[PDB]
Amino acid sequence: VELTDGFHVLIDALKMNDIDTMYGVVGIPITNLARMWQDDGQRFYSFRHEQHAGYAASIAGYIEGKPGVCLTVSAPGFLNGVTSLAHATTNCFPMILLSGSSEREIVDLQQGDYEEMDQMNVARPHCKASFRINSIKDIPIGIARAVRTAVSGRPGGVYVDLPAKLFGQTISVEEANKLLFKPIDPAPAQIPAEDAIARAADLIKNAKRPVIMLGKGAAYAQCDDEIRALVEETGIPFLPMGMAKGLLPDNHPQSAAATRAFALAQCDVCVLIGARLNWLMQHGKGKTWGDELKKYVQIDIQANEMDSNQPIAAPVVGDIKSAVSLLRKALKGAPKADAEWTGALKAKVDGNKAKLAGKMTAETPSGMMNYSNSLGVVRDFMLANPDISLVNEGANALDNTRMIVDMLKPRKRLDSGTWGVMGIGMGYCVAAAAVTGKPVIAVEGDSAFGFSGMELETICRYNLPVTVIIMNNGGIYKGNEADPQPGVISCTRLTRGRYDMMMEAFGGKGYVANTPAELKAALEEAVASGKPCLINAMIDPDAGVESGRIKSLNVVSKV
Amino acid sequence: VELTDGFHVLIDALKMNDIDTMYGVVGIPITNLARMWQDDGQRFYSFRHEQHAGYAASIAGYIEGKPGVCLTVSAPGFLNGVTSLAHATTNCFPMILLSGSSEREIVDLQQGDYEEMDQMNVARPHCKASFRINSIKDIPIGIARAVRTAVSGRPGGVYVDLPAKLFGQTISVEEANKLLFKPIDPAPAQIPAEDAIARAADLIKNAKRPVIMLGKGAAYAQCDDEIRALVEETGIPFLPMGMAKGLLPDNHPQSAAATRAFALAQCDVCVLIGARLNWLMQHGKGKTWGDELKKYVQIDIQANEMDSNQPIAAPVVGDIKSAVSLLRKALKGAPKADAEWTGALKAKVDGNKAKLAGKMTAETPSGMMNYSNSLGVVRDFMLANPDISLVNEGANALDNTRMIVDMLKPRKRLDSGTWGVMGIGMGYCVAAAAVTGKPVIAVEGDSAFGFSGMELETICRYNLPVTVIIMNNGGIYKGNEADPQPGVISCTRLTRGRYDMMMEAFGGKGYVANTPAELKAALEEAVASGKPCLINAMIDPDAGVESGRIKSLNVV
Amino acid sequence: VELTDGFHVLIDALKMNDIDTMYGVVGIPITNLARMWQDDGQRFYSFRHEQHAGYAASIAGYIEGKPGVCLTVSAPGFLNGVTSLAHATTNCFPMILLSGSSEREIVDLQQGDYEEMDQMNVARPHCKASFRINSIKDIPIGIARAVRTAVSGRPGGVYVDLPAKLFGQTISVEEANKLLFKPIDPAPAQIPAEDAIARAADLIKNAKRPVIMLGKGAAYAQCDDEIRALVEETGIPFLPMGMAKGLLPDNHPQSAAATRAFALAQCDVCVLIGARLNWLMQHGKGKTWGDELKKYVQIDIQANEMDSNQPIAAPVVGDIKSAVSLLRKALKGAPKADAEWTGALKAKVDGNKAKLAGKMTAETPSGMMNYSNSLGVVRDFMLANPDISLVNEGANALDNTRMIVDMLKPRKRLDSGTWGVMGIGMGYCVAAAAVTGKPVIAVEGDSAFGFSGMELETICRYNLPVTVIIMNNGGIYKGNEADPQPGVISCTRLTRGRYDMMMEAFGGKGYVANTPAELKAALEEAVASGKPCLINAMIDPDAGVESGRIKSLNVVSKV
Ligand SMILES: CC(C)(COP(=O)(O)OP(=O)(O)OC[C@H]1O[C@@H](n2cnc3c(N)ncnc32)[C@H](O)[C@@H]1OP(=O)(O)O)[C@@H](O)C(=O)NCCC(=O)NCCSC=O
Ligand SMILES: CC(C)(COP(=O)(O)OP(=O)(O)OC[C@H]1O[C@@H](n2cnc3c(N)ncnc32)[C@H](O)[C@@H]1OP(=O)(O)O)[C@@H](O)C(=O)NCCC(=O)NCCSC=O
Ligand SMILES: CC(C)(COP(=O)(O)OP(=O)(O)OC[C@H]1O[C@@H](n2cnc3c(N)ncnc32)[C@H](O)[C@@H]1OP(=O)(O)O)[C@@H](O)C(=O)NCCC(=O)NCCSC=O
Ligand SMILES: Nc1ncnc2c1ncn2[C@@H]1O[C@H](COP(=O)(O)OP(=O)(O)O)[C@@H](O)[C@H]1O
Ligand SMILES: Nc1ncnc2c1ncn2[C@@H]1O[C@H](COP(=O)(O)OP(=O)(O)O)[C@@H](O)[C@H]1O
Ligand SMILES: Nc1ncnc2c1ncn2[C@@H]1O[C@H](COP(=O)(O)OP(=O)(O)O)[C@@H](O)[C@H]1O
Ligand SMILES: Cc1ncc(C[n+]2csc(CCOP(=O)(O)OP(=O)(O)O)c2C)c(N)n1
Ligand SMILES: Cc1ncc(C[n+]2csc(CCOP(=O)(O)OP(=O)(O)O)c2C)c(N)n1
Ligand SMILES: Cc1ncc(C[n+]2csc(CCOP(=O)(O)OP(=O)(O)O)c2C)c(N)n1
Ligand SMILES: [Mg+2]
Ligand SMILES: [Mg+2]
Ligand SMILES: [Mg+2]
């Protein structure tokens, strides 16, 4: 009687659920799983730290809508990956963290096993579900549960614990072929009731000053044509959230992005599509909303997200494609949005964009670029080459890039997200590169960059078409904070380092850009090369503000 | 300018979400919330332990389809209640545990506050969501979140922590009104796609030996006519789980319940409606399903319940009403289930029902009834008087009542549930009585009863129309296990006590029933009286088996 | 080769660690463990609810100083027991909760097993350690870990999970006899350094107005003669906490119990022996301490209890017997406490006790006793028969009994404890009765009593010499609160029930006491009978105050 083993039943189970890629770091007891994945003919990206392997999995899930799969070792490795899972879950990204674990008997008596942890129970606050496959026969059901939990409902992270002893267990090949199966419809449509849609349609039809807010949930849904058709048919101005940029082209004539403050403050009806009223929208209260409760229409797959922050006049619960399709039919033939409202916003948009053009044009000393003229080069490049992933994180490097760099295409901009995480940079590059088969540009704050910088080597090791732009201003927010005491460096200072040399140390191409013209040539050459590059863009130490746009949220002393 | 406080904002917020009743036990810091709730004109049921106030909340949620609300105090009080919240969440019953809590400053530094516990964090395993309302301005939103989490998606338990310092906060009446609001559509319809339904419909159409399993999820949905119309148009044999009894009347001619083993073992397609393929269904494998993988259609609101145990050939995700109405239109005009299959099951049901009648008809010595002839009395009474709730727990007393007592009306049978909880009895009685305003009958095993027994006094204090029947066999399973050592009583033995005397200690009516005739006359008189009663039914000590139907789950 | 099994290896392991008693409720999968415990020749007390089985274990640990052992089923049963474990842990009582659990494979994939719960992980907030013995060979090490964790350091509750499949596992008898072992010195002495003791000795020697506070930690330590010798040699006034009553006789001439307010408010040095500065002492701050930081000396085995609430001038860390023995030698030969201080307190004590004697003497209508004249009968009885356990809980029934009922002997008074738990009544009776082999009296509030009342049957089933006194006033605090609306009973009302009849229903003896003289005869007759009794003492519905002594802690409306 012929036999297979846990390694292969897991390999096959993952393949049966359409996983052909993992991101990880090897070591006991999962090295030979990693090897066999590759022997079988599938991709493994080995990283320098499991956190960045996990950030990668997380954004592969966002981009593709199937779970990014991260593989780690026990206790210390798991723990590094679970920090990313946590991130996945918070951002609603389908992701599965698989981690080897030690011996049940010793761990449960807390005797001091190798890398001892109840990893299943430690993951619980950080995922939707935390499972463990103890037995070879349950691998296919276990992976099915993991894939459904990650992709269904509100998508998110799932932990699957893989005890050391799972892998060497054996089972007949006949058995395993019966047990192996592919879940039917793991992320199903969920259609809202007619009256939910009618309540929304009523509010929109009667709006004097309506605005649509698209979040990364809408982007994730992959119904770009449906959403655009809704915005166009209704004539409603729209505002994208950070990662919703490009869902509709950022230069769409109905965009009110360039006049956000006025739009939100003065609107009567606000239509939220896959966007939470969390801190990024100031919870639907205070100055930013004109000190009043708007009439919120909200489309979301999570029923109890409704009324989380402010009352929602027209809650629509279901998947965005299903809901938007119905809302469109419900609004079909109705008058377009108030022309004096859309005109008022269009005038503001033009006036504000003209003022930004004047900033991107201004001239600075060599090695002392500002955020406008430097990122204005990236803007121009991304308008000409839109089919490229734009990774972004930092304070001033994030806020100024979201404002300046226009995305014409969807699921391309990949940023710090719901938690404002510094660290997602290089993992996001690796994953974007792996899943898209196309170039990647990263605009990195230099502090931001340090949280995943060692993964330059990983980017080089896989010869990926990634171009890292370091907005090198020599610190956190600024690089010129005075020494607190004689010969003591300030806590916000960084070395104004030669990150180009660091990249060259691992076989990458390095550049220093001291002027907008130098940055242009370097970026054009780097992207066209198709090779791992890093551009060290020299930004004025005094150019940025404390925390960028969110300087209000700081706690300062007054006594 | 006129003020209101935390107590009143909470009361208003609760009322705005259609809550008019709470079950609880008062004390620091929430006694005055309880009082003011009553002063306002709302109901408060005080219990003798918070666990049973909790079980009462849970089943009120089930029956009504809106959160049962339990109110407790900090640490020890909270813990008692969260045991019940945990049970609710496991059973999918909407419920809100409100518990007062102590000083943040002192609790967070673990300094030894009064009844110190991080109740919010201790609640998390036992509920869908654990919240804390710290500030008066957030009460309307906090209560909206609790209600929506309890009733939307898979319904279940929510914990809301109410720090002592919440209640004494003030705010302008003008502000309070502005903040107070009513959630729109807190338990929304969720509709499945055409092709999820069409896949299910084709599985059913080409079935040769189909079966419909109805779970308490289907009973909870309150779409009794949709589900009955589905059964009667397809002509498919059906089977109810313990609390799905009465959804269709248990004597409906398409019921294959009395030949369950053969139906599950021999079916090819199995349509699960609001029922999990959990231990109660042998996880969809083993001897009870004929040692093969069936083609499953499953209708459930929780997407990731699919494939939890066995591959599901046709997963239909959505609320049962929406799914069933669509599935009905998809199957309309299609031929009925194969006649040789439905005729074969009907024949085995008839023969098995005849065997049971012989057991019920038979005669035993006075004071030594068995489970058949004793529960035959309850069967007849519930066929003649079906608009009565039936609470049931125990081992032999549960399993035999589920088999013998036919339910003809939906959401009446209220039993141990997914966790096989001994302890739900008297709390279930108080809630069922409170929310229906109609009579209740409890069939309680004597061990089962002792978990909530002291709540007899609660039932008497509120003068509720509850008749408690104790299956007094003198122990757990059996009342005659021998002393392991000389003069040492065995662990399964219970005093064969005068539970009737206990009932009468608190003002209720007691009966001792030694024969079926005595049981019948007592039950008829008790139910007609509309007073709190207890019938001490004297059962043969040797009439039980080990653990009832689930004897095989024991480790020897 | 001869074989034993998991049932017996556990039975033997428990016996090897000196457990001969368990308190529990049976059912799957632990019934046959319960049976075999008894077959082997050991005690099992079956209860009506696992909570009260657990409260029993908890107080058996306090009284004996070896872990009380509670046995339950999976999920629902475990959960009821863990509520008591939590109580054990909070109060510092050595206790082990053993619970059967379901199938690892199904539970870990959350498939819906019979009574499904990760009981190991659910217990964690409620015990010192939460373990699981998965394998037969680890049973003796597992039980050793449990016994050491419960009795060592600060004592407390330990959870031990017993998977269904543990019990039918087999092992040679030879193997099991080698593996079986008895821990050496599981609750060791811990001696404080000479300078810790000298710092305390200095503070005491210089005190003008010193007071010693004994807590139940000191009582638990079982060094009654050492502690009494310290109090007598130094001449320092002393105050017992609730369960420290009787450690020294409550009528000791150095007791300042009857003048607590003045003693605490006016002292300079306060010596805390196994007593926390928690809510029971108002955290060492405010009015009760004269709005000043005393010079605290504190003896405790838990190092980091020190400075938990207020700064501790002389922290002494170690076991109380070891610490007191050294402090005595350090103070030996020194002058006794200031005579004008001890005299001032002695005058207050006499004046206050005379005023209480006048209350216990007053006359009331039949069926309308107050708390003074009713409990004054119990006082007189407990002075004449001191070798009896006194269980107590309630609001006015607790506060008035602690004040009035004097304990001459140690570890006899057993009350609501650190959390003020209503529910410990009948389990405490069963356990006290089981471990002492002597009579038990309970003074129960009627609300308090309802939380464990059904365990009257258990008390009767084991024919235990327990006398339950129900302070029957018809409610919580009072029994006369007006109907809030017409025909609606107030939330604090209870039926003024015939609890005597309830007791008679299960073979117990019942009494109604309408007068102090009737209560006296009943109590005298009940205790001497040696049989399960209940006295229904009829107390005036209007006699008590809201929450007793802790009415300040209530939250009342003012708007
Ligand atoms: C919280 C926010 C959503 C709040 O939004 P705002 O910053 O107020 O608006 P933004 O959309 O970012 O745009 C800022 C302003 O630029 C304007 N804007 C936008 N696009 C344009 C163009 N194309 N041309 C001209 N002006 C433009 C826009 O109208 C705003 O002006 P007005 O209309 O005048 O307002 C955002 O700051 C955000 O997403 N922050 C993420 C912060 C983070 O994660 N940080 C990690 C580092 S933490 C650091 O300590
Ligand atoms: C696990 C189960 C779902 C398994 O279902 P079964 O018991 O096998 O089926 P049931 O529907 O109860 O029916 C039992 C048998 O009686 C038959 N049956 C049912 N109704 C009738 C009538 N009206 N007349 C004649 N026969 C009948 C039915 O065909 C079965 O025989 P066959 O077809 O021949 O099988 C059930 O036992 C259950 O719900 N258990 C919960 C137990 C629990 O939680 N207990 C708490 C105590 S724990 C104690 O230790
Ligand atoms: C928190 C406390 C330690 C605070 O102590 P106090 O109540 O202030 O002091 P107590 O020692 O209880 O005694 C009260 C008063 O009686 C006096 N006293 C004590 N003994 C005597 C005798 N023998 N004779 C005369 N007077 C006496 C003592 O000096 C006090 O008066 P003064 O010197 O004048 O103060 C205590 O209340 C306590 O242990 N409470 C437990 C509460 C609980 O757990 N409740 C559960 C139900 S919760 C209800 O809602
Ligand atoms: N397919 C989908 N259909 C509907 N809603 C979705 C879908 N996928 C994710 N969501 C929801 O989209 C929302 C994303 O919001 P958020 O992460 O706050 O976006 P942003 O930060 O861009 O505002 C979440 O509330 C999530 O439940
Ligand atoms: N309105 C509803 N629509 C769809 N599914 C529901 C609804 N209410 C509850 N459910 C589902 O019903 C199921 C209840 O199953 P279970 O408690 O195991 O029933 P039983 O014990 O009767 O088999 C759960 O899976 C739950 O998610
Ligand atoms: N053998 C021992 N030696 C020293 N300290 C002990 C010993 N056993 C318990 N303790 C300590 O005694 C203290 C008991 O305090 P607590 O429960 O607050 O008493 P009370 O409530 O009577 O004031 C705990 O801090 C505990 O760590
Ligand atoms: C994990 C993590 N650590 C710390 C922070 C706080 N934080 C926000 S921005 C930032 C760095 C900003 O500096 P930089 O990336 O260089 O951008 P700049 O303002 O200089 O352009 C840090 C550390 C964070 N958001 N996440
Ligand atoms: C809280 C809790 N504790 C224990 C159990 C285990 N258990 C199952 S049935 C049962 C009692 C069965 O005896 P009884 O209620 O008298 O029914 P009988 O078979 O005697 O008719 C117990 C204690 C449980 N399910 N829940
Ligand atoms: C588990 C638990 N629930 C609730 C409380 C709050 N509580 C304190 S005292 C009390 C009852 C007091 O009434 P009773 O026992 O009859 O004493 P009385 O004042 O009437 O003498 C309650 C419910 C508590 N301490 N513990
Ligand atoms: Mg910087
Ligand atoms: Mg029984
Ligand atoms: Mg009372």
From Swiss-Prot, chains A, C:
The keyword Hydrolase does not apply. Pathway: Metabolic intermediate degradation; oxalate degradation; CO(2) and formate from oxalate: step 2/2. It catalyses: oxalyl-CoA + H(+) = formyl-CoA + CO2. Substrate binds at residues 28, 114, 257-261, 352, 402-403, 547-549. Binds 1 metal ion per subunit. Coiled coil: none annotated. Keywords: Decarboxylase, Lyase, Magnesium, Metal-binding, Nucleotide-binding, Thiamine pyrophosphate. SUPFAM superfamilies: DHS-like NAD/FAD-binding domain, Thiamin diphosphate-binding fold (THDP-binding). It is an enzyme of class 4 (lyase). Thiamine diphosphate binds at residues 371, 395-397, 420-422, 447-448, 477. GO terms for molecular function: ADP binding; identical protein binding; magnesium ion binding; oxalyl-CoA decarboxylase activity; thiamine pyrophosphate binding. ADP binds at residues 154, 216, 276, 300, 320. Signal peptide: none annotated. GO terms for biological process: fatty acid alpha-oxidation; oxalate catabolic process. The N-terminus is blocked. Changing residue 115 to A: 2-fold reduction in the affinity binding and strong reduction in the catalytic efficiency for oxalyl-CoA. Mg(2+) binds at residues 446, 473, 475. Its cofactor is a metal cation; thiamine diphosphate. Changing residue 114 to F: 2 and 12-fold reduction in the affinity binding and in the catalytic efficiency for oxalyl-CoA, respectively. Inhibited by CoA and activated by ADP. Its EC number is 4.1.1.8. Belongs to the TPP enzyme family. PANTHER family: 2-HYDROXYACYL-COA LYASE, 2-HYDROXYACYL-COA LYASE 1. Homotetramer; dimer of dimers. Involved in the catabolism of oxalate and in the adapatation to low pH via the induction of the oxalate-dependent acid tolerance response (ATR). Essential enzyme for the bacterium survival, as it relies on oxalic acid as its sole source of energy. Catalyzes the decarboxylation of oxalyl-CoA to yield carbon dioxide and formyl-CoA. This is Oxalyl-CoA decarboxylase. It comes from Oxalobacter formigenes. The lineage of its organism: Bacteria, Pseudomonadati, Pseudomonadota, Betaproteobacteria, Burkholderiales.
